[PDB]
Amino acid sequence: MFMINILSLIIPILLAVAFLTLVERKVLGYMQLRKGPNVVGPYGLLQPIADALKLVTKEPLRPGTSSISMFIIAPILGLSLALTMWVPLPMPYPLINMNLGVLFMLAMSSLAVYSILWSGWASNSKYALIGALRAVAQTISYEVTLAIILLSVLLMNGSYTLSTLITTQEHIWMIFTSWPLAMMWFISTLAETPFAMFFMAEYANIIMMNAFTAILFLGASHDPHTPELYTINFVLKTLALTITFLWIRASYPRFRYDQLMHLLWKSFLPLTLALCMWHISLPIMTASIPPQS
Amino acid sequence: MPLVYMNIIMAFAIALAGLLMYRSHLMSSLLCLEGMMLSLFIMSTLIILNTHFTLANMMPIILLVFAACEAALGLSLLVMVSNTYGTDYVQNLNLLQC
Amino acid sequence: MNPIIYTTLIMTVMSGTMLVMISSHWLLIWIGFEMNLLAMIPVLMKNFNPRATEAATKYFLTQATASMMLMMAIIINLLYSGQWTITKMFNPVAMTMMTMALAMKLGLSPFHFWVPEVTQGISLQAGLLLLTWQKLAPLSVLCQISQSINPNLMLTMAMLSILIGGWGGLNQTQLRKIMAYSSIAHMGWMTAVLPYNTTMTILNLLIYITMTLAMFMLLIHSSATTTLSLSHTWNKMPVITSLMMVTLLSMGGLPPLSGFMPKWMIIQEMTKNESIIMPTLMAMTALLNLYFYMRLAYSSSLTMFPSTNNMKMKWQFEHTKQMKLLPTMIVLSTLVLPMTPALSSLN
Amino acid sequence: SMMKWNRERRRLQIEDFEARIALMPLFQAEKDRRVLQMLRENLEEEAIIMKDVPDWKVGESVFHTTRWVTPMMGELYGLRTNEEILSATYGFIWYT
Amino acid sequence: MTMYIAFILSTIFVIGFVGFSSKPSPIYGGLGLIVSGGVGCGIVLNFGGSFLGLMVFLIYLGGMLVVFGYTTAMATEMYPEVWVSNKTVFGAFVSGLMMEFCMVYYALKEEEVEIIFKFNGLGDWVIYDTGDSGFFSEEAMGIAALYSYGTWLVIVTGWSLLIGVVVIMEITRGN
Amino acid sequence: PGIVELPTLEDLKVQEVKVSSSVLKAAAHHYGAQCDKPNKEFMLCRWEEKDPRRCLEEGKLVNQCALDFFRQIKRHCAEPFTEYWTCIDYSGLQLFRHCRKQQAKFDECVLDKLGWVRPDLGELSKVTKVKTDRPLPENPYHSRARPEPNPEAEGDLKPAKHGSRLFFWTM
Amino acid sequence: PFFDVQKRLGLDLDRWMTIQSAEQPHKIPGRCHAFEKEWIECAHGIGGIRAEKECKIEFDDFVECLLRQKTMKRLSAIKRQRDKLIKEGKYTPPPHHLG
Amino acid sequence: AGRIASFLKNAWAKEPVLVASFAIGGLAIILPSLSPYTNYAIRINRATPYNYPVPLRDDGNMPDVPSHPQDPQGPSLEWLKNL
Amino acid sequence: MNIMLTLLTNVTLASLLVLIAFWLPMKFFLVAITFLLFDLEIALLLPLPWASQTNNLKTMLTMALFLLILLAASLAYEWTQKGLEWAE
Ligand SMILES: CCCCCCCCCCCCCCCCCC(=O)OC[C@H](COP(=O)([O-])OCC[N+](C)(C)C)OC(=O)CCCCCCCCCCCCCCCCC
Numbered sequence A: 001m002f003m004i005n006i007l008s009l010i011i012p013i014l015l016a017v018a019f020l021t022l023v024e025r026k027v028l029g030y031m032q033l034r035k036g037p038n039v040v041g042p043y044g045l046l047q048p049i050a051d052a053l054k055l056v057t058k059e060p061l062r063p064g065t066s067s068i069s070m071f072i073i074a075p076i077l078g079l080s081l082a083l084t085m086w087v088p089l090p091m092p093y094p095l096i097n098m099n100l101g102v103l104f105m106l107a108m109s110s111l112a113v114y115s116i117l118w119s120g121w122a123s124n125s126k127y128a129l130i131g132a133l134r135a136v137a138q139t140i141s142y143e144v145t146l147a148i149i150l151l152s153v154l155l156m157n158g159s160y161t162l163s164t165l166i167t168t169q170e171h172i173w174m175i176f177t178s179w180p181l182a183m184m185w186f187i188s189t190l191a192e193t194p195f196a197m198f199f200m201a202e203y204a205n206i207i208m209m210n211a212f213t214a215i216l217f218l219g220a221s222h223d224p225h226t227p228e229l230y231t232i233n234f235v236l237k238t239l240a241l242t243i244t245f246l247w248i249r250a251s252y253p254r255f256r257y258d259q260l261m262h263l264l265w266k267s268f269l270p271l272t273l274a275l276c277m278w279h280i281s282l283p284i285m286t287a288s289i290p291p292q293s
Numbered sequence B: 001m002p003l004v005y006m007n008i009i010m011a012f013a014i015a016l017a018g019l020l021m022y023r024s025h026l027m028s029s030l031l032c033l034e035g036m037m038l039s040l041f042i043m044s045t046l047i048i049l050n051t052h053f054t055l056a057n058m059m060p061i062i063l064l065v066f067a068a069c070e071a072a073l074g075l076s077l078l079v080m081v082s083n084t085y086g087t088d089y090v091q092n093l094n095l096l097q098c
Numbered sequence C: 001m002n003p004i005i006y007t008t009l010i011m012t013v014m015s016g017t018m019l020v021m022i023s024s025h026w027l028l029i030w031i032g033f034e035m036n037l038l039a040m041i042p043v044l045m046k047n048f049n050p051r052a053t054e055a056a057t058k059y060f061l062t063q064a065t066a067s068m069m070l071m072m073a074i075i076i077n078l079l080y081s082g083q084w085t086i087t088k089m090f091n092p093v094a095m096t097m098m099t100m101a102l103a104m105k106l107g108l109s110p111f112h113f114w115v116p117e118v119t120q121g122i123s124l125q126a127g128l129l130l131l132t133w134q135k136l137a138p139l140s141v142l143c144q145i146s147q148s149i150n151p152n153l154m155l156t157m158a159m160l161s162i163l164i165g166g167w168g169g170l171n172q173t174q175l176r177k178i179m180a181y182s183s184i185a186h187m188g189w190m191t192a193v194l195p196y197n198t199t200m201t202i203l204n205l206l207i208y209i210t211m212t213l214a215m216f217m218l219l220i221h222s223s224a225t226t227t228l229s230l231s232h233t234w235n236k237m238p239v240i241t242s243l244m245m246v247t248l249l250s251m252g253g254l255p256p257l258s259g260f261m262p263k264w265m266i267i268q269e270m271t272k273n274e275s276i277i278m279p280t281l282m283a284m285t286a287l288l289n290l291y292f293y294m295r296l297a298y299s300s301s302l303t304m305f306p307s308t309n310n311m312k313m314k315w316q317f318e319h320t321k322q323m324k325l326l327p328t329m330i331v332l333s334t335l336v337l338p339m340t341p342a343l344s345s346l347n
Numbered sequence D: 001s002m003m004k005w006n007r008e009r010r011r012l013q014i015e016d017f018e019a020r021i022a023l024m025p026l027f028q029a030e031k032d033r034r035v036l037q038m039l040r041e042n043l044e045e046e047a048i049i050m051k052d053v054p055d056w057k058v059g060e061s062v063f064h065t066t067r068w069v070t071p072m073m074g075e076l077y078g079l080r081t082n083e084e085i086l087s088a089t090y091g092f093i094w095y096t
Numbered sequence E: 001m002t003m004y005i006a007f008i009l010s011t012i013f014v015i016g017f018v019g020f021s022s023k024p025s026p027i028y029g030g031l032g033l034i035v036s037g038g039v040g041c042g043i044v045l046n047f048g049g050s051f052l053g054l055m056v057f058l059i060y061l062g063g064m065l066v067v068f069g070y071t072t073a074m075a076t077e078m079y080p081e082v083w084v085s086n087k088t089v090f091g092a093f094v095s096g097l098m099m100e101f102c103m104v105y106y107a108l109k110e111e112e113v114e115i116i117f118k119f120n121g122l123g124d125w126v127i128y129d130t131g132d133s134g135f136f137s138e139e140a141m142g143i144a145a146l147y148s149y150g151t152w153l154v155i156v157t158g159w160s161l162l163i164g165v166v167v168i169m170e171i172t173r174g175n
Numbered sequence F: 001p002g003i004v005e006l007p008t009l010e011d012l013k014v015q016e017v018k019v020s021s022s023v024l025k026a027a028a029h030h031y032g033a034q035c036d037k038p039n040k041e042f043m044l045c046r047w048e049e050k051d052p053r054r055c056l057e058e059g060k061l062v063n064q065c066a067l068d069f070f071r072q073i074k075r076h077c078a079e080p081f082t083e084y085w086t087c088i089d090y091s092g093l094q095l096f097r098h099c100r101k102q103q104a105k106f107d108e109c110v111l112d113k114l115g116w117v118r119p120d121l122g123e124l125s126k127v128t129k130v131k132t133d134r135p136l137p138e139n140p141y142h143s144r145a146r147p148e149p150n151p152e153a154e155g156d157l158k159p160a161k162h163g164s165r166l167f168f169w170t171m
Numbered sequence G: 001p002f003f004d005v006q007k008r009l010g011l012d013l014d015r016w017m018t019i020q021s022a023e024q025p026h027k028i029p030g031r032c033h034a035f036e037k038e039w040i041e042c043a044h045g046i047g048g049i050r051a052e053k054e055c056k057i058e059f060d061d062f063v064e065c066l067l068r069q070k071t072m073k074r075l076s077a078i079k080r081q082r083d084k085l086i087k088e089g090k091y092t093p094p095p096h097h098l099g
Numbered sequence H: 001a002g003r004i005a006s007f008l009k010n011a012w013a014k015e016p017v018l019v020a021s022f023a024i025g026g027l028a029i030i031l032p033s034l035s036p037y038t039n040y041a042i043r044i045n046r047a048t049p050y051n052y053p054v055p056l057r058d059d060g061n062m063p064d065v066p067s068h069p070q071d072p073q074g075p076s077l078e079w080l081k082n083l
Numbered sequence I: 001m002n003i004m005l006t007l008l009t010n011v012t013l014a015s016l017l018v019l020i021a022f023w024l025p026m027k028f029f030l031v032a033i034t035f036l037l038f039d040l041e042i043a044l045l046l047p048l049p050w051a052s053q054t055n056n057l058k059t060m061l062t063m064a065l066f067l068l069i070l071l072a073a074s075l076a077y078e079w080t081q082k083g084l085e086w087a088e
């Protein structure tokens, strides 16, 4: 029945990808004195169905100067990635308990840059070429802060096994030991994230990033007998983070590129190095090095 | 010596031959370059893991981290030769006739 | 380049070469070659002229190709013996594979087409580094594995290098091309004796090295880039051409001018190994190097050449460079033939 | 708080390791019998299958030295169901 | 049979190399190389190289090859070429397939060909040992010893990387 | 090139312990305490002899004492054994953390019924000596004869006869 | 090395990893540790010329362990006749072989 | 005094980031050889037994090693128990 | 067996969705190199969590700190000599 478990994950995540959009528009709506989708079905419950089947009935126009092969495989990778990093999440018990789950999460999430890079190239337009160039450099700039934060975070965890994160936190949320890193981590997650697909690809990244941040910094207690306790806690924590993720979507003017690079390489990277230096010696400092096994 | 072991070996040979003759593009030439180290990284990895050389697992990652110094310098040369001549085309590298 | 940046750049080039000569592990050897390449390119790209960019690209492509081709040979050795030491390799394919990779980085066999061009585009001062210091590390490795070398392959590399070294230099006018083709011919001379005796290779190394700085740095002091430009040196600096001519005569290998010392000992050592057709051929074609050596010597000091009116201006001013190590390099490269039994010191 | 909890985990890990140490020798004897049983079965099959060959007497020592080479995974199982090879060879690597 | 995992990934690695070794478009060569890099991880992972394999996916795939995509996009030749643009690309593609067809078919039939090395070889599943790693991942302990037994490999590796920075800015400075 | 000696199937017949891993780990701590000498001498054979075929009778003893160790805990408080190992088996990592009361319900028999004590931290990890009949192997690696080292140069240095002896160079 | 500076000052730069039977972390052994130990110990203080011929069986056995070549072909011809024998129904695998 | 206090004021006014990272790195690289716990850290690291403690051949006069894991002889882990 | 099975079905649903979708109806290169050089430095300091449990931890602390000091130096150099500042 293991295959059934995959569909018991991919589809609801796909629906979860579908259904937080109404949350977004109504949160973004009610924020600006507005109402959000509330006329199509009760409180816009059927609004996601109101757009999806319309989109699939819309003809997918293709640019004349577009390489079809790349134009159709770039979304293939984009969706394939966006629904793959959901598999090793230590949600109650992960589908895959890869001993190197954190590395697998990073390598495969850093692969998303290919989709946007190919989309700009395959589209073959002046707008698409720069937009791909801007998006990728913004993205490829920000794994170095991503990797260091996660690396330095995991010194006090014990290994890259994502299931071990629960044991590490247990007593207190792990933010209380690395809250300078949490703001370091959370901000970096904002910027790293056919056309019908591209909704799904980046969007699962939005929730999973917050799901990834949820387990990493704000853990829960996984009772061996009853697993529903971790389920509710995990969902509630990743909902609060995502609401915050859209809380800041309509609360700041968007970053400009020169500051976007300046913010990292001159005010985020050097501080990330110091915290990593702080969190590499502190387990040694207090003889609190964790067990890998 | 298993079938796969020399599936990398020929892959290195094909990558070497691809780098040993240029068609028209310096980027494509560079692609065969770190392709050769990929098989080189790959080939070393099977040897060390198969032989349980518990201390040689160092070598693969530093094989990659040092092949990068070639690559990083590699394109950075090309960006120079593709901004004076404009094109990465390698037939424009004959200005040193005499 | 900021002098502090340039000094550290040279410093790691020497460190990269030095690491090669002092590393037992095969992997560390490839690291030393990697660091040497990593910092050789910026030195060539110091003038920032298109010829330099051309030369650096050619040098990088052939050196990086041989570097990872070298790395492949080590892995095969690991594949067949599980070793990492430099004592004697255990796979005949790896023997040729690395011999090809090591040799290409010296530019002697058909793997030499970069050497004339890479030194041509880059500046004269950086050329001294390329043809003197970048030629010890690959030679250092070759001496260490001289036990397992394949004589049939290696001597074919020597014959071609000397033949191409003389023939190529005959047709060149740019004195940078003259030096590289002479350097290739000298490289074939030293490279022929590794299967027989590594010590004679070393002696050929120091004598060839000192000779190259003697010629190159004298060329620096004269500030000349062509044979015609070198011709005018007699009017401004008559002395410079006087020693420069005697260096050319020694470079040919005419006794008692030292520089005949390596060729003499190289012939003698191969003769002890019952190889007697081989010494004769290289010795006979060694005269080919002498022809363009005399040709360069002819139109610099032996016969004065039509100077220029503006040359009178140069007489009034004086050189500012302190030409460090130039004098003792000339003497050490022109009079040390009587002190040949110092061969025992190298052993 | 992390200092106190982490040391608690280290005390937990060594106790877990203590269980593994105290319980390892039984499997060493068990794995010892298993491979020797599997080798003896392979040689017994060899003494049933291969007679027509000119000179391939059973149980030739591939290694010159009279030591005990650790049996390499191939001739260990070798002549078994392809599922057995797949489970024995990859197994742990694929169990995830 | 999942036993085909023996050769399936390795032969895909070969055709991945022939894809870009035949000099297709630099974007296409990147596609061919990352595909080979992607399947190359499978061989390492099937051998136990989780940490080493994922690093290829990290720096080789998400790193090295991305900056190649950056440079190639910057070049943006006025007329990008396709795998059909030159028949030589297809000619090499059919050629590279033919040599691997010869090797594989020779491997599957006689198992004793003599190209360069002795060749030989059955399914790769043999060469594994029958030992156990206990509680320590043999790979992880190997690379963790970088800071313990390799305190000299680190210095030369680190020093070159900093020197790697100085050279990069020195030759791209542009005067 | 040599007979690969292999003991027959008849000698390879032990009373194999038919217990799962969780029950093994639950009683592992007390197993090591009260049955060290079988295991201690067997693995000394495994490390000294360095040959599986050389260590078979000791392989008989370790399993036999395991059965001898697994009989009294059946005879005395089999039921507390069940509850402990049925909770240990639940854990995917066999975590001893979420088994404390059931652990207490185990060792209080052996404290008073069998007179055993739960080993403390780092007790079974102690390296220990063993008194065994087994003689020290003459060459565990089956080393053959050794090559004769090259003779060492003897006699003091003397001046080189007639100097350099390099062509006409006399001294 | 060409210049054994590490020999003079007596500090280990690259000898920790040069062979597989060194002080491996946590004493995890190499696969051919036993054979390499014999080959190294046989070929010590003998010189490359003499040791290459004298300690030959040590190197050959260690090479076979390192490469898994000769006994692999022993297995290859094991299966070769098996497929060439059971196919025409000359013999049937026993129950333990079947599983 | 005057120069340094102004300089830190000069630093910490316009930019707090680099002075924060320099400080955090400063403690992170000085403090290692200050506290009496890095010796504790290496001791529990050595305490964790990965491989088996292979026994030694008993032939008399080694009172250090025990004849039983319950014996008082040999190393004592009680220091970590309160640690 | 399990891993690629999850990958296979993931792309397959990605395949079926897109198939019915299109059938039913100098500065930029500069930092990209610096990121490359930095990223390779990241891989060097990745195995740290296992390295924290070595027996030679005293030499680990100096060595592991050495990378971060040296890596920061590359950033510090790149910043000072114009460079890392967004070029034009
Ligand atoms: C013993 C103690 C050891 C550890 C001590 C650690 C040091 C002391 C604490 C340092 C400061 C706190 C940690 C670092 C924080 C970032 C530092 C930094 O660069 O700031 C200035 C940076 C840059 O500010 P700037 O660009 O104006 O100025 C920087 C300095 N100069 C001018 C020189 C460049 O601030 C930002 O980047 C602004 C925010 C950008 C993102 C926009 C969305 C923000 C959303 C905020 C609300 C949500 C927060 C969620 C948090 C996570 C929840 C899970």
Ligand SMILES: CCCCCCCCCCCCCCCCCC(=O)OC[C@H](COP(=O)(O)OCCN)OC(=O)CCCCCCCCCCCCCCCCC
Residues within 6 Å of the ligand: C237, C238, C239, C240, C241, C242, C243, C245, C246, C256, C257, C301, C302
């Ligand atoms: C192996 C075979 C021979 C090989 C070498 C052959 C060398 C000669 C031929 C070279 C080939 C080219 C042809 C000649 C070209 C000469 C070009 C030249 O520069 O000529 C002019 C030049 C001008 O010299 P000028 O600067 O005026 O200085 C004069 C001294 N004040 O003239 C000069 O610069 C010459 C200056 C001569 C200075 C020599 C000083 C000697 C001092 C000897 C002291 C002895 C002390 C004895 C003590 C005894 C007791 C202990």
